[PDB]
């Protein structure tokens, strides 16, 4: 009673990726998921499934599967993992300590880096408190780092929260853009609709 394939291509092959701070999440349900297209490709620089068997994915049915897509630089990819610290994990995108899914990343220097510097991509540098897991904040209010209130970015202790990347093709690999896709596996007391090819409900 289910034959359509899950549109993983609409996320990985998407023309543009949303900024990391405003990470874009897509819900996936009512389809047959062929994960072997993902966990066998050699183009991915980082492929780590946390909490699940990465090879036995084609045998599992799930209630819903969520795919989050964004881009960061190379040295910040290590922050996309359960139990991590840093500007991306604390303020931009936080995974829970019991994250059940896969973390996928690959270099995109030939896509997201324009000649001279790509400032379209941004990321949060200052925030009041650390982000609870899977919290998506977009407030661009002036961050107050001192005892004096702020109205406008001028004056010390008043900064614009979002920081833009300087992605150029000449930048070092550690400072090059890396498209990241995070798969979240959710199972509830509900009809499991995201199954692998050789699943049990079939």
């Amino acid at each position, epitope marked *: 009673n289910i034959t359509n394939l899950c549109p993983f291509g609409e996320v990985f092959n998407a023309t543009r990726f949303a900024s990391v701070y405003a990470w874009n999440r897509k819900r996936i349900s009512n389809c047959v998921a062929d994960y072997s297209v993902l*966990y*066998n490709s*050699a183009s991915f620089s*980082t492929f780590k499934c946390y909490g699940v068997s*990465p090879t036995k994915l084609n045998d599992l049915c799930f209630t819903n599967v969520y795919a989050d897509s964004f881009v960061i630089r190379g040295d910040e*990819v*290590r922050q996309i*993992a359960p139990g991590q610290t840093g500007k991306i994990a604390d303020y931009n995108y936080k995974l829970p300590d019991d994250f059940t899914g896969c973390v996928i990343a690959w270099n995109s220097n030939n896509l997201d880096s324009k000649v001279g510097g790509n400032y379209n991509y941004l990321y949060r540098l200052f925030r009041k408190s650390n982000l609870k897991p899977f919290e998506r904040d977009i407030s661009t209010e002036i961050y107050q780092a001192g005892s004096t209130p702020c109205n406008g970015v001028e004056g010390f202790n008043c900064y614009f929260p979002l920081q833009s990347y300087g992605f150029q093709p000449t930048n070092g690999v550690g400072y090059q853009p890396y498209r990241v896709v995070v798969l979240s596996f959710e199972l509830l007391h509900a009809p499991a609709t995201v199954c692998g090819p050789g699943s049990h409900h079939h």
Partner: antibody
Amino acid sequence: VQLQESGPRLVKPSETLSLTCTVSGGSISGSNYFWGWIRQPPGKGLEWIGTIYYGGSTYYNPSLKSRVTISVDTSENQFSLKLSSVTAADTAVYYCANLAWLRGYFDYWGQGTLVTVSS
Amino acid sequence: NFMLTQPHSVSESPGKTVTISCTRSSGSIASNYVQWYQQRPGSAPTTVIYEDNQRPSGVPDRFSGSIDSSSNSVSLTISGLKTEDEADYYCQSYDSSNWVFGGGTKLTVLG
């Protein structure tokens, strides 16, 4: 109950080498595994040679991309290995192992075969 | 494009706990999974730990693997050492094009 190596042990130096790894109990046409080659000199460490997925995608060791080619045929359900222009350092016990779906750990190993290059 | 470094040799008494580190020379070790293999004298290797912490059904739970984030390395821990575990151990990882093994570790059970 799956893997076992071939029998052309002796190889003359400066010539080529050929080994085959037969897979019993399981269709190699059922491409759900990678098939790799691993060698080790007597009392030395393991070195990866190359893997092959039946979809055609091959991966070779950069130190051996000039001399190593790996094929596979479903007519007899086995994958081969070519090591051209053999040298004295290539004396090793060549294991063929099965690799699971993901590029992770080798599931099913063989028992290897020692090749020696002398005259 | 990278390598994996293992200690020369280790040694401990029976029933004790030993640790073997697998240091990566280039890149982040947390990029992909790191595995461990146990090769007894003469015979073929066998997977003990995979996915940096996972044991296949049939391997004693005495083996365990953890991560050391700062030193850019993973570690294999063997609690309750037995004389049957006296063998060579290798670590293996994959980095986007290559499967790379480590140097090796000669485990010696004392007493």
